[PDB]
């Protein structure tokens, strides 16, 4: 209290409380997980369908930053869309200034700086979304990164953001992600998402998969309907 209104104010114990408020705002969003397989990265996002009136795919939280980069936003949706636009612009500028696809580590760094720059001024508020950037290339392997509202970014082997981050992380650590290709990581991700989902509280939901890997030639694309149905069947078969 008092040290809490602006992101430019430091609390007496030394923390920016607006940033932490943004983090716990992200905490209230639906879970979204990302797992880098042996030869790629798979993003699995649960999406709470608030009203049946929404069409399928509306408010999709999978964003294609570049030809080879995908995002798995979680948190405020408008902030997520704005950050997606920022990441797309950064990738386009890198392509136009250097002539080749932006490395996902550098792209994550730049978008992390853009996020962090909004946690310094009293005129602007910290971004209310935390996202995942995933990519694959034949020269850099498979890479995954997570950016929080604070702007802190480092690579993860597999992670979750949203409501059940810890619950999904318990079921993520029990996978030997270094070995299997993403073809089976897809159904494993679907099973994890279906387990972490709370049917009695979040009512209905839709699971959206995306992947970027050698099986996809390196481009990040939404998982085709057949594989999505197979993964959903696998997840449903694990009811006991």
């Amino acid at each position: 209290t008092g040290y809490d209104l602006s992101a430019s104010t430091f609390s007496p114990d030394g923390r920016v409380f607006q940033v932490e408020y943004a983090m716990k705002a992200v905490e209230n969003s639906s879970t979204a997980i990302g797992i880098r397989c042996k030869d790629g990265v798979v993003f699995g996002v649960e999406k709470l369908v608030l009203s049946k009136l929404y069409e399928e795919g509306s408010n999709k939280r999978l964003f294609n930053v570049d030809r080879h980069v995908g995002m798995a936003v979680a948190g405020l949706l408008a902030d997520a869309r704005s950050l997606a636009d920022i990441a797309r612009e950064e990738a386009s500028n890198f392509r136009s200034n250097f002539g080749y696809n932006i490395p996902l580590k550098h792209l994550a760094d730049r978008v992390a700086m853009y996020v962090h720059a909004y946690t310094l001024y009293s005129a602007v508020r910290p971004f209310g979304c935390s996202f995942m950037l995933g990519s694959y290339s034949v020269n850099d392997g498979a890479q995954l990164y997570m950016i929080d509202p604070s702007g802190v970014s480092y690579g993860y082997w597999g992670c979750a953001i949203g409501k059940a981050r810890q619950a999904a992380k318990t079921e993520i650590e029990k996978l030997q992600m270094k070995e299997m290709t993403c073809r089976d990581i897809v159904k494993e991700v679907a099973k994890i998402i279906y387990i972490v989902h709370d049917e009695v509280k979040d009512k209905a939901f839709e699971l959206e998969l995306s992947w970027v890997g050698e099986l996809t030639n390196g481009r990040h694309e939404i998982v085709p309907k057949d594989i999505r149905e197979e993964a959903e069947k696998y997840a449903k078969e694990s009811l006991k």
Partner: protein
């Protein structure tokens, strides 16, 4: 509490209260409904008259030959947004010589309306937009909220007393795709009348319709033009 005065201040619960108040501003406007068939997108709005003899306020705005919107919220924000999308559609038609697809326009609307929700100085656009438009990917009924979050809705309703219309749309959603233009407009009129109180009824002087179809540009029907759609409507049970 003390975190309620600015859109730039995060609440300790993780909420932006000014954003929620901007959402609350939508229900201050009258109810409007939008719904799409496999071939047409139709949005019906209930117009409000401030005096017994003053004209009813325009509720459906014309944006482009293939895109038209209904407004529920601040008149100033609605007019400013309408001007912005008119300019965007004109620029798209000037550069690419192709009508702007509805999805890209709605994404631009969300991007534009998110700026006030993060940078201090300008309040969030306190208006909900029902965007009905036909493009090469079929008819579309988007809805845009003041929090700059846009939903691709099969059939939506926003404004005051619009929950009944939303329930009606949820119940009758399955029949919307395989409906002709007249059946779709009658379903929209029924959804609109669900919001009306018991004493009020949909007359030709307070209903505005907007239709954009396969071979039909976005046309707005008001007053007598509403009558062909109004006639033949089943009377509300009582």
């Amino acid at each position: 509490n003390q975190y309620d005065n600015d859109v730039t201040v995060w609440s300790p619960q993780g909420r932006i209260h000014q954003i929620e108040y901007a959402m609350e501003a939508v229900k201050q406007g009258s109810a409007t409904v939008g719904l799409k068939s496999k071939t047409h997108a139709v949005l019906v709005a209930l117009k409000r008259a401030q005096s017994e003899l003053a004209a009813h306020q325009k509720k459906i705005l014309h944006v482009d030959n293939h895109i038209g919107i209904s407004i529920a919220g601040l008149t100033a924000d609605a007019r400013l947004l309408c001007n912005f999308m008119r300019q965007e559609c004109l620029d798209s038609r000037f550069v690419f010589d192709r009508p702007l697809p509805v999805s890209r326009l709605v994404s631009l609307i969300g991007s534009k309306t998110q700026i006030p929700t993060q940078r201090y100085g300008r309040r969030p656009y306190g208006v909900g937009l029902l965007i009905a438009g036909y493009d090469d990917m079929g008819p579309h009924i988007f809805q845009t909220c003041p929090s700059a979050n846009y939903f691709d809705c099969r059939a939506m309703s926003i404004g005051a007393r619009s929950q009944s219309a939303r329930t009606y749309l949820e119940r009758h959603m399955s029949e919307f795709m395989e409906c002709n233009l007249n059946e779709l407009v009658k379903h929209g009129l029924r959804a609109l009348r669900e919001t009306l109180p018991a004493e009020q009824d949909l007359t030709t002087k307070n209903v505005s319709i907007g239709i954009v179809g396969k071979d039909l540009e976005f046309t707005i029907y008001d007053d007598d033009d509403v009558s062909p759609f109004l006639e033949g409507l089943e009377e509300r049970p009582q």
